[PDB]
Amino acid sequence: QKLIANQFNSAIGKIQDSLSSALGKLQDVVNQNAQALNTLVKQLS
Amino acid sequence: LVKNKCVNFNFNGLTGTGVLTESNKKFLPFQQFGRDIADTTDAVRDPQ
Numbered sequence: 001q002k003l004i005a006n007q008f009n010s011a012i013g014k015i016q017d018s019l020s021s022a023l024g025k026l027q028d029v030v031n032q033n034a035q036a037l038n039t040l041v042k043q044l045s
Numbered sequence: 046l047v048k049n050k051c052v053n054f055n056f057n058g059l060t061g062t063g064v065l066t067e068s069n070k071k072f073l074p075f076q077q078f079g080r081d082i083a084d085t086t087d088a089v090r091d092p093q
């Protein structure tokens with residue numbers, strides 16, 4: 001139990017570290033929404 | 046000038062409709078109006 005809990009606590013620390021660097025799947029939805037609206041307004045010219 | 050009302054305007058040949066209010070931003074001395082990333086006009090300089 002001690003070893004298992006230590007491995008778990010250590011692994012959560014590596015997630016927290018890695019996320020302080022991966023979100024491309026969320027970011028590119030935000031980008032595509034904005035890029036489509038900017039295209040729609042530019043197209044009025 | 047008529048600030049803070051929806052007005053129809055003509056600044057020195059640049060025309061539109063909108064509400065005019067004093068800006069925090071400042072242009073270079075030769076620049077006459079501002080545009081945003083979409084190329085809509087977001088600010089203007091009063092010629093008087």
Ligand SMILES: *[C@@H]1O[C@H](CO)[C@@H](O)[C@H](O)[C@H]1NC(C)=O
Nearest residue numbers: 046057074075090091092093
């Ligand atoms: C325009 O004329 C007014 C009235 O004399 C004066 O207060 C103002 O400073 C002048 N502005 C320019 C840009 O000449």
